[PDB]
Design a protein around this ligand. Structure first.
Ligand SMILES: CC(=O)Nc1cc(Nc2cc(NC3CC3)n3ncc(C#N)c3n2)ccc1N(C)CCN(C)C
Ligand SMILES: [Cl-]
Ligand SMILES: [Cl-]
Length: 324
């Protein structure tokens, strides 16, 4: 059997809070008025939803409406969003509405004038990345301090209105309350941002999963390679990580937690030395790289979830000296 694990920070936030804080199934929703919103255009779609740009007709403000396609999953997202409302750089849930006849619910968010990261990330300066990384860290330390793991940290879930230097960590639909010893679903986050704990099916993970995901984002931004670890599937995703971090530290990790690796992994992982971060530094990205960026990245991208920086430790890193 695998060795148990608990978060080294905010372990019992949900334990010492009242039942109604984490017990989202008991939360009774007070519905807003659907007729306050006019849908303007489709912005996207997910597995469980469709997203639209809308207008709040009572004040002419732009909003984002997420129309939900499971009752338990709906209440979880709402409770997390309400718990986190007002938190630094956390998307604001402005309203919750429902078709009064069909009962189909929808969440109304504040609008962020985002620039697609495939266009934006190319124009960001060294200072810009440090600033935005510090802003994501504020949201992560906040949600973690409130006993919540985001579990889907990636650039598409980070809205940036660059003109206003405004950042919001969005789509808390995969977010979950942390309870020490709980066995969580490893089928979370986007492939490229999945922590090794998920890829090896280690279910007793915690907030430190978000720090890996953030590490993947930092690497993609300072090295101008999006995504940084580009696997063709979940198995190959771990191979991509092993080709950078090396197999020795991977097998030490599996060994430490007594993880039984899938038979598929053995032959495909092979043997790879740990690469120096400097290897990924080239003429075009060098202006975004510094010894502090590499030391910071190196402390985020650790196989052992218990050895990655916490969001508060990350905010203290010298990489953010000019920002703070
Ligand atoms: C709303 C949400 O939770 N997810 C979401 C938002 C978008 N897109 C946008 C776009 C904008 N602004 C730009 C048009 C200018 N903004 N501004 C604020 C918010 C919020 N919240 C927002 N969302 C697209 C797909 C999705 N999901 C459902 C896809 C799948 N998930 C699992 C990743
Ligand atoms: Cl979705
Ligand atoms: Cl943290």
């Amino acid at each position: 059997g695998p060795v148990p694990s608990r978060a080294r920070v905010y372990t019992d936030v949900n334990t010492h809070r009242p039942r109604e804080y984490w017990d989202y199934e008991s939360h009774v929703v007070e519905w807003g008025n659907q007729d306050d919103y006019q849908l303007v255009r489709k912005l996207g779609r997910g597995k469980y939803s469709e997203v639209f740009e809308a207008i709040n007709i009572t004040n002419n403000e732009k909003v984002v409406v997420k129309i939900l396609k499971k009752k338990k999953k709906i209440k979880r997202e709402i409770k997390i969003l309400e718990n986190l409302r007002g938190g630094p750089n956390i998307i604001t849930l402005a309203d919750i509405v429902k078709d009064p006849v069909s009962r189909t619910p929808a969440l109304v968010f504040e609008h962020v004038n985002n620039t697609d990261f495939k266009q934006l990330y190319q124009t960001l300066t060294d200072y810009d990345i440090r600033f935005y990384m510090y802003e994501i860290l504020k949201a992560l330390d906040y949600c973690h301090s409130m006993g919540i793991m985001h579990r889907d940290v990636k650039p598409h879930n980070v809205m940036i209105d660059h003109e206003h230097r405004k950042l919001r960590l969005i789509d808390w639909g995969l977010a979950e309350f942390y309870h020490p010893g709980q066995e969580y679903n490893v089928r979370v986050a986007s492939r490229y941002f999945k922590g090794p704990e998920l890829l090896v099916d280690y279910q007793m993970y915690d907030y430190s999963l978000d720090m890996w995901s953030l590490g993947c984002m930092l690497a993609s931004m300072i090295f101008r390679k999006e995504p940084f670890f580009h696997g063709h599937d979940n198995y190959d995703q771990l191979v991509r990580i092993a080709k950078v971090l090396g197999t020795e530290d991977l097998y030490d990790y599996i060994d430490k937690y007594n993880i039984e690796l899938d038979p598929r992994f053995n032959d495909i992982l092979g043997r790879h030395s740990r690469k120096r971060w400097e290897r990924f530094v080239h003429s075009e990205n060098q202006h975004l790289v510094s010894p502090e960026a590499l030391d910071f990245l190196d402390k985020l991208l650790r196989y052992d979830h218990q050895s990655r920086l916490t969001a508060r430790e990350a905010m203290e890193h010298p990489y953010f000296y000019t920002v703070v």
